Structures are given as structure tokens and as C-alpha cells.
Design a protein around this ligand. Structure first.
Ligand SMILES: *[C@@H]1O[C@H](CO)[C@@H](O)[C@H](O)[C@H]1NC(C)=O
Lengths: 48, 49
């Protein structure tokens, strides 16, 4: 089972993580059934 | 394939459905027949397992 929990929070702090409490709601459970040992973030470039 | 051919020579469309169970969670399920809801009585309830 692949559990994805998520939470959206409106913050206005410039640099670091804000200090507070916010429990993450369960968003989606995925029937993947695969081995995962490594991950990588995906970003977006800005072209001009 | 001619329309005047015999039944042993007429075209037959064949669809073969293959059902396998793997160790991943099974997600192609059948329709789960739902009994109408009855309230205010001592009944045996089965809600989502
Ligand atoms: C999952 O992957 C890791 C690293 O590739 C490996 O050591 C481990 O044995 C794998 N587990 C299964 C159940 O395949």
C-alpha cells in the first residue's frame, strides 16, 4: 500500500519551517505493490 | 470471410479475459451489491468490510 498524506498550510515566514501544529490528512492510497528504496524530487525550470 | 459461408467458416470475435492474482492489492473488483439501509432496529451491519 502506498499511503500519501498531505496538508496545505498558509504561512508567511521567509526562510525556515514555522513552529506550530498541523495534522496531515490522508489524501490517497495507491495499490502499487512494488519495491521502493530511493526517491528524487522533480522541479521545474524557468526559461527566458 | 463471406456472408454466405457456413457457421464453421463465419467470423467469430473472441475476447479472452485473463484474471491473475498478484501480491499487490487487488483493485479490479466486482460490483458490491448494497442492501437498502434500515434504521432504528438491531441489525447486522457490514459497512466497507
Ligand atoms: C527491495 O530493494 C532492495 C534494494 O534494491 C533489496 O535489497 C531488497 O531485497 C528488495 N526487496 C524485495 C522484496 O525485492
Amino acid at each position: 500500500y502506498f499511503k500519501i498524506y498531505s496538508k496545505h498550510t498558509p504561512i508567511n515566514l521567509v526562510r525556515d519551517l514555522p513552529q506550530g501544529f498541523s495534522a496531515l490528512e490522508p489524501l490517497v492510497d495507491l495499490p502499487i505493490g512494488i519495491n521502493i528504496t530511493r526517491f528524487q524530487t522533480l522541479l521545474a525550470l524557468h526559461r527566458s | 470471410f463471406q456472408p454466405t459461408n457456413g457457421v464453421g467458416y463465419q467470423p467469430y470475435r473472441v475476447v479472452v479475459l485473463s484474471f491473475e492474482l498478484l501480491h499487490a492489492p487487488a483493485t479490479v473488483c466486482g460490483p458490491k451489491k448494497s442492501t437498502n439501509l434500515v434504521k432504528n432496529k438491531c441489525v447486522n451491519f457490514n459497512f466497507n468490510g
